[PDB]
């Protein structure tokens, strides 16, 4: 009976151990499949790194494209304007031609303005002496030389009446002329400023063109650009088309994935959480397979031992 107290309780305890080890058997299967999922990164990370991630290679490609298409706008706008100065140079030439027109015009109308003043004044000289002559003659009272003397004033007054004729046209013409000139002069000033305004715009476009050229040059030969055949030459001793093993599945996960924008952050973190709890009882597989089997076999063994024990008990 003491032998029974020993065998049955030990049989219960080892069965408790069997169920406890079963509680970790599923955990170890989970650990194995979890390690396989963990190694899935061996394919995933290496593949989008071997074929450097699209957010890098295609990102460089697209930014290079947008920079390239930016390359031509400044220079295109520049082609016409840089040579448009020659038309502007010719316009300035026309304006200085109108300046020469101003010079000659103003000069000759000033000349007729002097002509009018002289024609009135200098001819006024003889208009003056009429009275001196008539009074001189009259002072000889003491026979009839008075008539021809009294005739002069009529023709003299007619002469001066006719003289004032020009005055008017002369006066008006000059200003009319001057104003025309002024307007042109005015136009002239505007243009000189305009060239400057344009020239500043031209300098801006030239600077922008040089700047975008700098960005074009730097956009290539970048460390990642210099990395061509390095993210690809990590196979320094296995470049034999043997990589096709991942070809179809990675192609499905790629071009036809409908999503390729730093999608690594979906699994690169989840792998950390799952891998953070593992490697526990990894080598406890043998006990859960052979030692457990031996224990559960000695279950019938000592079960029949107890059969014979209680049979002797009945024999009492």
């Amino acid at each position: 009976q003491g032998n029974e107290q020993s065998l049955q309780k030990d049989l219960d305890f080892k069965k408790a151990k069997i169920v406890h080890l079963r509680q970790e058997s599923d955990k170890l299967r989970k650990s194995v499949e979890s390690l396989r999922d963990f190694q899935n990164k061996k394919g995933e990370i290496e593949l989008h790194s071997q074929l450097l991630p699209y957010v890098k290679v295609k990102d460089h490609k697209e930014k290079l494209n947008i920079y390239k298409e930016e390359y031509e706008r400044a220079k295109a706008n520049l082609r016409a304007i840089l040579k448009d100065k020659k038309p502007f140079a010719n316009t300035k030439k026309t304006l200085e031609n109108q300046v020469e027109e101003l010079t000659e015009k103003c000069s000759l109308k000033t000349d007729e303005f002097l002509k009018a003043k002289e024609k009135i004044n200098e001819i006024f000289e003889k208009l003056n002496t009429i009275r001196d002559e008539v009074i001189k003659k009259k002072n000889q009272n003491e026979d009839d030389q008075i008539q021809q003397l009294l005739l002069k004033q009529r023709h003299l007054l007619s002469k001066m009446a006719s003289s004032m004729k020009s005055l008017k046209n002369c006066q008006k013409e000059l200003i009319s002329t001057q104003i025309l000139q002024f307007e042109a002069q005015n136009m002239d000033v505007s243009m000189n400023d305009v060239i400057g305004f344009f020239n500043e715009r031209e300098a801006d476009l030239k600077s922008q063109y040089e700047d975008k050229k700098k960005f074009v040059k730097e956009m290539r030969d970048t460390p990642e650009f210099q990395s061509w055949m390095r993210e690809i030459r990590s196979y320094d001793q296995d470049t034999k088309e043997k990589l096709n093993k991942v070809a179809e599945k990675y192609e499905e996960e790629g071009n036809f994935n409908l999503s390729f924008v730093q999608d690594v952050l979906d699994k690169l973190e989840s792998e950390i959480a799952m891998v953070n709890h593992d490697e526990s009882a990894v080598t406890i597989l043998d006990q859960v397979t052979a030692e457990l089997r031996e224990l559960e076999h000695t279950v019938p063994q000592q079960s029949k031992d107890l059969e014979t024990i209680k049979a002797k008990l009945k024999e009492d």
Binding site: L51, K61, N65, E69, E70, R73, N244, A247, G254
Partner: protein, 76 residues
Amino acid sequence: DPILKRTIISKRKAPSNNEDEEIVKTPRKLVNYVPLKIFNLGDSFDDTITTTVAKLQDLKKEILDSPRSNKSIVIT
């Protein structure tokens, strides 16, 4: 030069119709000095609640600094 890698990579492009300006560009306003940039990146989880974790950080030590269990030593 293996075909598959470059097959995976792409170089075809469409620089023909795309333009930097859809029709025209809006010129910079003489007072176009809008400060902007009041906040760029963040707002993952609320942080005032994280201040609560900061408080628990020393609450744990404060509670540790006290009589704790196995004090059944009373007699007579």
